[PDB]
Design a protein around this ligand. Structure first.
Ligand SMILES: COC(=O)c1n[nH]c(C)c1Br
Lengths: 300, 237
């Protein structure tokens, strides 16, 4: 079980660690989070009390280094840092633990939510969407735009999601215009899966990462990407059964975890009504359809 | 953006543009079958592609053979329209290609945009106007060429006849839409107005009678009156 040490908490802040969150008061004695499950990516995120603007956070995998959080009073944010002195790290951590100055990652043993939400998410693919190669961890916030978004302004700070555009030459074979537009299986299976993502696990990993950035940071381009990748599968007549069954599970746990008071801005009515009720896969998302109807029937 | 009454004069500027109407592409008669069920039988159709500045009409005749063995024909018809419009644009020299295509029905936007991906510099636009181009098949010479076709075919017309030698494109388009609105609202009456006098002739190379200037004023007044009335005869006013 790993730890994220915090130097201190000089400003009052709501801290998230995966789907959990807690409040820390200004200059509260607080030195981080312990008992973090190894074997998953994680995200630690921040909402300052004074400025509910800018949610921001760091994707990380405790197997890739010793990471701690230090507040920067110049840039005005909690920064993730990697400690390369491994004995300095263990010794500080040991002292924090002895003083019981760390909150415990509060995973209930029955609870598989985080695994279910990050099943296909891998750090090496996050680091290709979020380009900052000097760090083993990846910063995301509310305002970052996507590559696709910037084609319609600072490239260094972009989310480099795979571009999906239904009215593009990439998506539409010459001489198959109607066929490829109404049935996107060509674009899903050949262009995207075989060509770009190589396999469905990589496709699902980007889909899950986009959702999580939409949910935790309100990142709008992320929400667009999540819906686009859902729509591409639902609008394909030919989808491997194993992908359809896993998509149903994936969406079910995303919809289950979404904050109920955020469904107005985070769920695209058109995409969901098409996927559940009109598309080729209207009958293939049983679990997702059932949670959607019992939790968000207004939308439908 | 969309075309409406505010930006109506844009039609007559010097940027080449085409209207595309697909109302008459897929046409059927509905009839009872031996077993007392209902069936459709397609008849020949046409794409109405019009340059409103010049009057040039590109009438692509849609022969019933194109539907044989196909499903979801109302949807297919929009894509076939888009394929033929795109083929038309491809066949033209670059300096004759439209800078904008205005579709009369919004359902044509996605089919045309997809078939025109190779022409990023051609804007596909809808309109808010309720244009009466569906009444094109009430023009006898147009209905005739469509019905007689035994194969796919493109026929070229000027829907303004020689009017532009005397009036502006703006006035010619207003005359045309008046005629077509009348034919749409009451074809029998509108045709009675045009052909009541058999003394006045249609030139072999024209669609409309050879009215003098003063007969056109009379004709247009009779067409307005018709449209005024039928709007009463319908709303009782
Ligand atoms: C380097 O500064 C630090 O504050 C630090 N270094 N390691 C750990 C665990 C911490 Br907290």
């Amino acid at each position: 079980m790993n730890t994220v040490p915090f130097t201190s908490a000089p400003i009052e802040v709501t801290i998230g660690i995966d789907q959990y969150s807690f409040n820390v008061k200004e200059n509260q004695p607080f030195h981080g989070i312990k008992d973090i499950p190894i074997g998953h990516v994680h995200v630690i995120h921040f909402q300052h009390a004074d400025n509910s603007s800018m949610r921001y956070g760091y994707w990380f995998d405790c197997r890739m280094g010793n990471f701690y959080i230090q507040y920067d009073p110049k840039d005005g944010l909690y920064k993730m840092m990697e400690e390369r002195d491994g004995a300095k790290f263990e010794n500080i951590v040991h002292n924090f633990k002895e003083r019981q100055m760390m909150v415990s990652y509060p995973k209930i043993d029955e609870d598989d939510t985080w695994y279910n939400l990050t099943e296909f998410v891998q750090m090496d693919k996050i680091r290709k969407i979020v380009r900052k190669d000097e760090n083993q961890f990846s910063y995301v916030d509310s305002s970052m735009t996507t590559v696709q978004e910037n084609e319609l302004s600072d490239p260094a700070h972009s989310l480099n999601y795979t571009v999906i555009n239904f009215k593009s030459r990439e998506a539409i074979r010459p001489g198959h215009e109607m066929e490829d537009f109404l049935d996107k299986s060509y674009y899903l299976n050949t262009v995207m899966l075989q060509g770009i993502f190589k396999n469905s696990s990589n496709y699902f990993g980007e889909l899950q990462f986009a959702f999580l950035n939409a949910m935790f940071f309100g990142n709008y381009g992320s929400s667009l990407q999540w819906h686009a990748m859902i729509e591409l599968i639902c609008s394909s007549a030919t989808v491997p059964k194993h992908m359809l069954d896993k998509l149903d599970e994936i969406l079910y746990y995303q919809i289950k975890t979404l904050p109920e008071q955020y469904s107005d801005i985070l769920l695209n009515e058109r995409v969901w009504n098409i996927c559940l009720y009109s598309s080729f896969q209207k009958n293939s998302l049983h679990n997702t359809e059932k949670i959607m109807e019992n939790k968000y029937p207004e939308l439908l | 953006g969309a075309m409406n009454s505010s930006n109506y004069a844009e039609l007559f500027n010097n940027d080449i543009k085409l209207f595309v109407d697909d109302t008459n592409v897929y046409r059927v008669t509905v009839h009872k079958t031996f077993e007392g069920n209902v069936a459709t039988k397609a008849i020949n159709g046409c794409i109405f592609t019009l340059n409103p500045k010049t009057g040039h009409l590109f009438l692509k005749i849609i022969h019933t053979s194109v539907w044989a063995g196909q499903k979801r024909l109302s949807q297919l018809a929009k894509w076939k329209t888009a394929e033929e419009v795109s083929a038309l644009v491809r066949s033209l020299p670059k300096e004759e290609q439209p800078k904008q295509i205005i579709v009369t029905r919004k359902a044509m936007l996605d089919p045309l945009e997809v078939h025109m991906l190779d022409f990023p510099n051609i804007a596909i636009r809808p309109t808010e106007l309720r244009l009466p181009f569906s009444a094109a098949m009430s023009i006898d010479k147009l209905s005739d060429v469509v019905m007689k076709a035994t194969e796919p075919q493109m026929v070229l017309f000027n829907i303004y006849d020689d009017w532009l030698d005397r009036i502006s494109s703006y006035t010619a388009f207003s005359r045309l839409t008046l005629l077509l609105r009348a034919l749409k609202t009451n074809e029998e009456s509108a045709k009675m107005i045009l052909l009541s006098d058999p003394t006045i002739t249609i030139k072999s190379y024209h669609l409309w009678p050879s009215f003098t200037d003063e007969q056109w004023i009379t004709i247009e007044s009779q067409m307005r009156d018709l449209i005024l009335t039928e709007y009463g005869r319908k709303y009782n006013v």
